[PDB]
Structure 1
Amino acid sequence: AVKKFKPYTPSRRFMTVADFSEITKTEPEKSLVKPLKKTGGRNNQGRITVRFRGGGHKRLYRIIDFKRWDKVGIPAKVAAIEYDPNRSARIALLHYVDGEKRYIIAPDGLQVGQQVVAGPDAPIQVGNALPLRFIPVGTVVHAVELEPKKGAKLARAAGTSAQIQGREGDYVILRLPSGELRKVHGECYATVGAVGNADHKNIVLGKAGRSRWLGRRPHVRGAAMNPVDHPHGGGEGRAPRGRPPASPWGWQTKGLKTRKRRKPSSRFIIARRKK
């Protein structure tokens, strides 16, 4: 994992790339891809609404199966594991004995050539999807639905995992990747195992050029601006913040909680995140 480079340019010193050894197929499934329209961070008004975005490599979108409960009981062979540019995780190509072909995000330890299945009866085995209530308490799990039949919402990123801690009634207790303890409904599906490609966080981008490849445009500090641009803008020479550190839009950016207080899911959060 994590391929290094000799320092033969200044930027190769620290640049590390993924080793891609789990990949078995280097071109996507034509039936499962569609064009991913780059927004550049512009909304339908044409206005930049998320700053410093654009100019990254072209990408096609892989249709990922975040349901899996609509092919209950139909086994599928893991045909390949493919590089997906729209997500940190790797993806897995499934050939259902049905004849259907679908993508899922590749959990850790998944081996090409094995079988996976989904349903209340599925073996508790890496790559299988079951309603949260049928999964043994204590087992790690990923790609979890937050509400039944609404699609997998949590624990989708590379390396991430949610652990089933307990259950009460129609709900089980998860420890999300963040360390929040949340009640999620038992009928919500989830895939046992943690998401693969855990070495994803040890990638050293290496140079400004690699952030540009990813579509991330240069970020300009508030302190680098003028008072017409930002609370931190101006001052003769360099200047400390000189007020509570704030965003471009005025709100404080150090500590100020921003989750809506009266949000209904508060009743279902047992403990706010850790660390």
Structure 2
Amino acid sequence: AVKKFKPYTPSRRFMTVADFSEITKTEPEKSLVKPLKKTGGRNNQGRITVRFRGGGHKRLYRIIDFKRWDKVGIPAKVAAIEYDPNRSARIALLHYVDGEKRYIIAPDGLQVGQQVVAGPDAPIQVGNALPLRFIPVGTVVHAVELEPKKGAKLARAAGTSAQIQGREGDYVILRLPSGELRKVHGECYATVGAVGNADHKNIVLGKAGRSRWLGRRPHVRGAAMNPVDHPHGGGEGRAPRGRPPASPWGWQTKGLKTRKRRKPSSRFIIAR
């Protein structure tokens, strides 16, 4: 989708909005299973650690289910599909037959009315979740766990997905939304299908405000400020850095790798 606009105001011409057709007549969220008071704040205890944040629409947290072995075997019916301000993926709310309700990040396909479930059993269909081993090599899938019982963590962004590649001992090779081939443990669930609402990468914010709404204040270039507060700074009419591009704190930012070398997680990785 992606709503468009006629130019009746510069900016609201290039501006592009999402299409909330996929939003089952829902909107008002569900008390109980979410929401919780969401403590918004751009800095830690005192100081500001991440810069340029703050401001932007008030938000309510939708406490989603990111570990599904909670209900192994208990099937549930997908009730609605709603908007979640805390993420890029739309989310689906679903009523188990157990009578319990919980939200799930909604996969592309999954339609309201559908029945979905989790566990070793589970049929390989959009929405169902199973330990990685039991999933057919090659099938795509989202909401992966990295270590058994620790909760989903990979491919959860709007319309992202990972594809299974092979098996190898108690591990199974994956291919993350980034292109890295990772070795994940067999016992990590991963609900099947891709995340959906993949038009998300196409929304043209539009104006200055639009960014402000999502809570992101203006970002000033180092080049603009002085030597006192950033490498690229001073002296006359602009300047060409004058040294290898660096961050406010001073480490190179055009090429310098960061992953800490001797990490134990190294051996389970294979790509880029």
TM-score (norm 2): 0.97
Q: Which moved more, 1:261-270 or 1:32-41?
A: 32-41
Q: Which moved more, 1:214-223 or 1:41-50?
A: 41-50
Cα distance, 1:122 vs structure 2: 0.3
Alpha-carbon distance in 1 for matches of 2:13, 2:44:
41
Alpha-carbon distance in 1 for matches of 2:123, 2:12:
45
Cα distance, 1:27 vs structure 2: 3.0
SS in 1 for 2:267: helix
Cα distance, 1:161 vs structure 2: 0.2
Alpha-carbon distance in 2 for matches of 1:225, 1:36:
40
Alpha-carbon distance in 2 for matches of 1:39, 1:94:
26
SS in 2 for 1:167: coil
Cα distance, 1:133 vs structure 2: 0.3
CA separation of 1:212 and 1:261: change in aligned 2, threshold 3 A = same
C-alpha distance after superposition, 1:198-241 (max 9, x if no partner): 00000000011100000000000000000111000112111011
- The answer to whether the Cα contact below 8 Å between 1:87 and 1:157 also exists between their aligned partners in 2 is yes
Structure 2 counterpart of 1:249? 249
- The answer to whether the Cα contact below 8 Å between 2:36 and 2:63 also exists between their aligned partners in 1 is no
Q: Which moved more, 1:227-236 or 1:197-206?
A: 227-236
Q: Which moved more, 1:53-62 or 1:21-30?
A: 21-30
Cα distance, 1:270 vs structure 2: 1.3
- The answer to whether the Cα contact below 8 Å between 1:39 and 1:54 also exists between their aligned partners in 2 is no
CA separation of 1:41 and 1:263: change in aligned 2, threshold 3 A = farther
C-alpha distance after superposition, 1:60-103 (max 9, x if no partner): 00010001111000000000000000000000011000000000
CA separation of 1:221 and 1:33: change in aligned 2, threshold 3 A = farther
Cα distance, 1:33 vs structure 2: 5.7
SS in 2 for 1:63: coil
Alpha-carbon distance in 1 for matches of 2:223, 2:35:
39
Cα distance, 1:44 vs structure 2: 3.7
Alpha-carbon distance in 2 for matches of 1:177, 1:233:
37
- The answer to whether the Cα contact below 8 Å between 1:32 and 1:102 also exists between their aligned partners in 2 is no
Cα distance, 1:39 vs structure 2: 6.0
Structure 1's unaligned 5+ residue stretches are none
- The answer to whether the Cα contact below 8 Å between 2:33 and 2:102 also exists between their aligned partners in 1 is no
Alpha-carbon distance in 2 for matches of 1:118, 1:124:
10
Q: Report the count of equivalent residues.
A: 272
CA separation of 1:64 and 1:34: change in aligned 2, threshold 3 A = closer
C-alpha distance after superposition, 1:98-118 (max 9, x if no partner): 000000000001100010000
CA separation of 1:52 and 1:38: change in aligned 2, threshold 3 A = farther
Cα distance, 1:46 vs structure 2: 1.9
SS in 1 for 2:166: strand
Structure 2 counterpart of 1:138? 138
Q: Which moved more, 1:216-225 or 1:24-33?
A: 24-33
- The answer to whether the Cα contact below 8 Å between 1:41 and 1:49 also exists between their aligned partners in 2 is no
Cα distance, 1:32 vs structure 2: 4.1
* Larger proportion of strand: 1
Alpha-carbon distance in 2 for matches of 1:167, 1:98:
34
CA separation of 1:36 and 1:14: change in aligned 2, threshold 3 A = farther
- The answer to whether the Cα contact below 8 Å between 1:41 and 1:51 also exists between their aligned partners in 2 is no
- The answer to whether the Cα contact below 8 Å between 2:34 and 2:64 also exists between their aligned partners in 1 is no
Root mean square deviation of aligned Cα: 1.4
Alpha-carbon distance in 2 for matches of 1:32, 1:227:
52
Cα distance, 1:171 vs structure 2: 0.6
Cα distance, 1:42 vs structure 2: 3.8
Alpha-carbon distance in 2 for matches of 1:249, 1:36:
36
C-alpha distance after superposition, 1:5-59 (max 9, x if no partner): 0001001111100011110133344334656666665444221100000101011
- The answer to whether the Cα contact below 8 Å between 1:77 and 1:95 also exists between their aligned partners in 2 is yes
- The answer to whether the Cα contact below 8 Å between 1:79 and 1:95 also exists between their aligned partners in 2 is yes
TM-score (norm 1): 0.96
Alpha-carbon distance in 2 for matches of 1:41, 1:146:
28
Alpha-carbon distance in 2 for matches of 1:98, 1:166:
35
